Curated annotation (Swiss-Prot), chains A, B:
Coiled-coil regions listed in the entry: none
Homology family: Belongs to the KEAP1 family.
Cross-link (N5-[4-(S-L-cysteinyl)-5-methyl-1H-imidazol-2-yl]-L-ornithine (Arg-Cys) (interchain with C-151 in KEAP1)): R85
Task of the protein: Substrate-specific adapter of a BCR (BTB-CUL3-RBX1) E3 ubiquitin ligase complex that regulates the response to oxidative stress by targeting NFE2L2/NRF2 for ubiquitination. KEAP1 acts as a key sensor of oxidative and electrophilic stress: in normal conditions, the BCR(KEAP1) complex mediates ubiquitination and degradation of NFE2L2/NRF2, a transcription factor regulating expression of many cytoprotective genes.
Domain comment as written in the entry: KEAP1 contains reactive cysteine residues that act as sensors for endogenously produced and exogenously encountered small molecules, which react with sulfhydryl groups and modify the cysteine sensors, leading to impair ability of the BCR(KEAP1) complex to ubiquitinate target proteins. The Kelch repeats mediate interaction with NFE2L2/NRF2, BPTF and PGAM5.
Modified residues (S-(2-succinyl)cysteine): C101
Whole sequence portion shown: 51 to 179 of 624
Domain BTB: 27-99
Protein name from the UniProt record: Kelch-like ECH-associated protein 1
Modification after translation: Non-enzymatic covalent modifications of reactive cysteines by electrophile metabolites inactivate the BCR(KEAP1) complex. Accumulation of fumarate promotes the formation of cysteine S-succination (S-(2-succinyl)cysteine), leading to inactivate the BCR(KEAP1) complex and promote NFE2L2/NRF2 nuclear accumulation and activation. Nitric oxide-dependent 8-Nitro-cGMP formation promotes cysteine guanylation (S-cGMP-cysteine), leading to NFE2L2/NRF2 nuclear accumulation and activation.
Record-annotated membrane-spanning stretches: none
Covalent cross-link N5-[4-(S-L-cysteinyl)-5-methyl-1H-imidazol-2-yl]-L-ornithine (Cys-Arg) (interchain with R-135 in KEAP1), where: C101
Localisation: Cytoplasm; Nucleus
Top-rank taxon: Eukaryota
């Protein structure tokens, strides 16, 4: 038989998936993030991408129903900027923050079981010692 | 600032996206493939993943409408096994075929503008000379 693999493929396809998110195309979930006194924010995304990067989103979205179109999800207890950075991680494989954001991002990463990000924020805080 | 990147992330997330496809979870498009006298076949998938690997699927799915749930798409002129192998490439970054399938797969890859696969099937046919 003949077999071929493009190693860069998953990188490239996520690059296009991030473009479709920024263009709000093919999105099926709107995350409405309200945290304490911060202004409410909204993030549109694709459930299957969120599901691929967070076990908590996967279970949140996999239910027996064929949901029709655009589901709104109310998100509590995480700041808008943290959610934004986590969504960006799901779509880009990278995350960036100032040395004083690192703690709230781990909080959010623990809450959405983003294993990779938890391990990294823990390494950083320990190195600050 | 503090910055982190998981290089394996896009690989891992596609691995979960392929699992959700095999489990028919979060799918929003069913490709009904009828080719000549071959039996009709069906493939469920996620539009945003198809869109990320084929410029032709992207334009096919990005329209002004918020489509409600599960769109059926009739696909002509490509054999079921070729479509299957192209879908698998979109979700796994790899494709495999016997030395006599290579020509029909390039046909399908040209038809869906899967650049990476076209270039590879062309290299193989030329090396058979």
């Amino acid at each position: 038989t003949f077999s071929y693999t493009l190693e860069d493929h998953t990188k490239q396809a996520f690059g296009i998936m991030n473009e479709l998110r920024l263009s709000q195309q093919l999105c099926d979930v709107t995350l409405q993030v309200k945290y304490q006194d911060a202004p409410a924010a909204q993030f549109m995304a694709h459930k299957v991408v969120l599901a691929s990067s967070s076990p908590v989103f996967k279970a949140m979205f996999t239910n027996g129903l064929r949901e029709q179109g655009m589901e709104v999800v109310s998100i509590e207890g995480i700041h808008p900027k943290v959610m934004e950075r986590l969504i960006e991680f799901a779509y880009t494989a990278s995350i960036s923050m100032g040395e004083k954001c690192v703690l709230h991002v781990m909080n959010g990463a623990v809450m959405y079981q983003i294993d990779s990000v938890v391990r990294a924020c823990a390494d950083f805080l320990v190195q600050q010692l």
